[PDB]
Amino acid sequence: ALDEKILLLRPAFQYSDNIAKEYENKFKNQTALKVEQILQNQGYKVISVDSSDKDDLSFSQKKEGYLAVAMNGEIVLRPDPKRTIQKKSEPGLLFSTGLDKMEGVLIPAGFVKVTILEPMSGESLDSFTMDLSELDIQEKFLKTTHSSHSGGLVSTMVKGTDNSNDAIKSALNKIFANIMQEIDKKLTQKNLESYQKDAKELKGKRNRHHHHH
């Protein structure tokens, strides 16, 4: 079929501080692998590059490579500040829960940009940015601080809990799904092969640019 190589760069993602390192790493790794799957499904051989910066490509890689795909992003999950309810234990209301609870919703923010480049010149052949704020993600969470006028309460009646990490997981799942969906839209053998002319031209301009002076 196609003897053409695509250089897949490592995703460069920054996140908000509330997202665990484990979650960040799994996100990065699965992003890279799913993009790999997409490109292989469209008929290209994929070379995984041990970097995310196009300049750290070896000349070998720039040579064998038809195109390079670069991802970068800021993935933020923060509460919608309007929807944080802080209902506290009313002392003696016939039923007194000695736990103070908070209730909120996490919304997405930031961006993920995918860029198709010509390896030799490093010039951008195309790019699409997905705005994460545009996703309608509202993941409810509740955490329970141990309240102030409950010191006498014994261990059993004050078991705090927090489900933030589950909401973070759910939000990252949807984000990942919607993102891979867009990427699958864009990285079609038809879209990628439509760059072949400019890619040849740019390689040429930069391949001859090395051999003059």
Numbering used by the authors: 26 to 238
Sentences from the paper on this structure:
H. pylori adhesin A (HpaA) stands out as a pivotal adhesin that plays an indispensable role in the successful establishment of colonization by the pathogen. Originally characterized as a neuraminyllactose-binding hemagglutinin, HpaA is a 26 kDa lipoprotein found on the bacterial surface and flagellar sheath. The gene encoding HpaA is prevalent in most H. pylori strains, and its amino-acid sequence displays a high degree of conservation among H. pylori isolates. For these reasons, HpaA is considered a promising vaccine candidate against H. pylori.
The crystal structure of HpaA26–233 was determined using a C-terminally his-tagged protein construct, excluding the first 25 amino acids from the mature lipoprotein. Initial attempt to crystallize the full-length HpaA2-233 was unsuccessful, leading to the engineering of the HpaA26–233 construct resolved at 2.9 Å resolution. The protein crystallized as two homodimers within the asymmetric unit of the P21 space group, a conformation that likely results from the large crystal lattice and tight packing of the protein within the crystal, with 40% solvent. Further characterization of the molecule using multi-angle light scattering confirmed that HpaA26-233 exists as a homogeneous and monomeric species in solution, with a calculated molecular mass of 22.5 kDa. The crystal structure reveals that HpaA is an elongated protein consisting of two successive antiparallel β-sheets, with an apical extension protruding from a more globular domain composed of one of the β-sheets surrounded by three α-helices (α1-α3-α4) stabilized together by hydrophobic interactions. The overall fold is well conserved among the three homologs, except for the apical domain, which exhibits significant structural and sequence variations. Of particular interest, the apical loop L5 harbors an intriguing feature in the form of a hydrophobic 118-LLF-120 motif that is fully exposed to the aqueous environment. Consistently, all four 118-LLF-120 motifs observed in the asymmetric unit are engaged in similar crystal contacts with adjacent HpaA molecules, burying the leucine and phenylalanine residues within a neighboring cavity formed between the α-helices α1 and α3. According to the cell adhesion assays, the flow cytometric analysis unveils the significant contribution of the 118-LLF-120 apical loop L5 to host-cell recognition, as mutation within this loop resulted in a 55% decrease in binding association with AGS cells. Interactions mediated by this motif were severely impeded by reverse charge mutations (107-EETIQEE-113 mutants) leading to a substantial loss of binding activity with a 50% decrease observed.
